Amino acid sequence: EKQKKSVLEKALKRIEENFGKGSIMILGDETQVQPVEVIPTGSLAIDIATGVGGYPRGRIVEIFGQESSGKTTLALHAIAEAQKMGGVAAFIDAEHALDPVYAKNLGVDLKSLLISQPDHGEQALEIVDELVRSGVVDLIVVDSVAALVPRAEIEGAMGDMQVGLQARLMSQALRKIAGSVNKSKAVVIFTNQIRMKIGVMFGSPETTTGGLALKFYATMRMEVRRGEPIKEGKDVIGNVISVKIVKNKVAPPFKTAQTYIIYGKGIDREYELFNIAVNEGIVDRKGSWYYYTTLKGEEVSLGQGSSNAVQFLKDNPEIAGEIERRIREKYGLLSVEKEEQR
């Protein structure tokens, strides 16, 4: 039996070591998996689904979905997390749609955010490559792929004989970026659409032709979908989202995270934490009242109903932290270099 697996595992290793880490995996192998350096996503559910607890440094990630799916909110959290760790984030903007007020409330430090609003696709991708190469930037969000229009097309020259030269030019710029990110501490995230293709009408594959290179250059690809409304009494206060990791080269793919966007706040860390804790049986419910037992044995009353329990978590960071660590440990994420005393 085990001899069957050790020959198996050994062969898997051989192939994997032949073609690069993550080249082949056992889909059920959350063993452990092995931590790599990541920037957390801002969602505990997504962190779990990635298998490594976040976006891996030195890699490209694609986040795609319809307009208004929640991909914008994910990208803003990625920025916020990169800043929170003490890093520097850049936003390469071809949409011109940022809501600075939402971004700030969600947790982005607007003052320190680097911003570029490039003239065209090639320039955008060259700026990204230089930023990666500079060594000074932790996380770059590129929004978005579709908007990434070739110079010539913009100047309306399409043209002289070759219409698809840029396709190659873009794929080439991307290849440069892939080259540079491997030697860097940077995470590079591209957001991409499945909605409203440009310039006119009906659709080719949702993700764009630069996207093919993206499809293959990316270490993770995440498909975001808007789910059911969330209501507090008779007000809708947000909606559920699902985030399916359709490609993952550092842990097993095809995990789907369910998480929650609260309007005006983003993926509220305490709201998500409460729901996950409750789903995991770590916080329990006695009638309408919620309770938690600390590791040290204290049984603590979180309050009556979800809204009170979520606020309690906000008012009691030390308890929230413990509940979160327990969840992360359970799924093998806890960094574990964490030191206790302060």
UniProtKB/Swiss-Prot annotation:
Localization in the cell: Cytoplasm
InterPro entries linked to this entry: AAA+_ATPase, DNA_recomb/repair_RecA, DNA_recomb/repair_RecA_CS, P-loop_NTPase, RecA-like_C, RecA-like_N, RecA_ATP-bd, RecA_C_sf
GO molecular function, one term: ATP-dependent DNA damage sensor activity
Pfam family, one: RecA
Predominant cellular place of this UniProt entry's protein: cytoplasm
Keywords: ATP-binding, Cytoplasm, DNA damage, DNA recombination, DNA repair, DNA-binding, Nucleotide-binding, SOS response
Matches recorded under SMART domains: AAA (SM00382)
Record flagged with keyword DNA repair: yes
CDD domains, alphabetized: RecA
Keyword DNA repair appears in the UniProt entry: yes
Parts of the chain that traverse the membrane: none
Binding-site residues for ATP, renumbered to this chain: 65-72
One annotated Gene Ontology cellular component of this protein: cytoplasm
An example Gene Ontology biological process: DNA repair
Function, as annotated: Can catalyze the hydrolysis of ATP in the presence of single-stranded DNA, the ATP-dependent uptake of single-stranded DNA by duplex DNA, and the ATP-dependent hybridization of homologous single-stranded DNAs. It interacts with LexA causing its activation and leading to its autocatalytic cleavage.
Assigned protein family: Belongs to the RecA family.
Protein name: Protein RecA
Taxon lineage: Bacteria, Thermotogati, Thermotogota, Thermotogae, Thermotogales
